[PDB]
Paper text:
Mutating Ile→Phe to give [name] rendered another collapsed structure, but with eight helices in two 21-symmetric 4-helix bundles interfaced by unusual bifurcated helices. Thus, the bulk of Phe cannot substitute for β-branching at d to maintain open α-helical barrels. Moreover, the KIH analysis revealed that helices with the same sequence participate in different quaternary arrangements.
In summary, solution-phase data and X-ray crystal structures demonstrate conclusively that different classes of Type-2 coiled-coil (CC) peptides—i.e., based on abcdefg repeats with predominantly hydrophobic residues at a, d, e and g—adopt a range of distinct states.
Numbering used by the authors:
A (entry chain G), C (entry chain F), E (entry chain A), F (entry chain B), G (entry chain C): 1 to 30
B (entry chain H), D (entry chain E), H (entry chain D): 1 to 29
């Protein structure tokens, strides 16, 4: 319910964090 | 309930961290 | 229900985080 | 059913994340 | 229940780890 | 039954993973 | 059944990984 | 069936990651 929706919101933010981290890693690779 | 509010707070923080990493990645270009 | 759906979305996001962290490890190494 | 499927996908992601943590730990030294 | 508690604790830890990665990245970029 | 016991053991192991991940996040600071 | 047994096996493995990660983190702290 | 086998394979790999990480920790000291 409220917990499931908040976990979905957390998951989406975590996914976006992952993609930003990968972008940073790739910038470190030039 | 209390767990839902905590998860929302963590999501908020992750959004902020992701923006900073994207700024850092641009700085390395 | 929605809880299982949220757990599946959490799993996908955590998988993306795994790939991102590996990329960062690659960038640190070489 | 869908809950068992979600648990299995979550376990797989936990395993992949643990592998990445192990890889990251190796890279730190 | 305990699984919901565990997901919350793990989400909290992921968030703290994400902060630590962001700080590490900040140092690497100068 | 045995599934509920397995889920409880999984929840407790996930909490241990949470504790370890917070420990690792702190170790990146220093 | 076998799913619950395998989930218990996975939980034990996850606990062992968490302990190893915690040990690494605390060794990194010094 | 397939889910139980998957979980067992993940568990086997997880413990192997743990043993590698334990070795990394010992090398630090």
């Amino acid at each position: 319910g409220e917990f499931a929706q908040a976990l979905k919101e957390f998951a989406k933010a975590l996914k976006e964090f992952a993609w930003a981290l990968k972008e940073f890693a790739q910038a470190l690779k030039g």
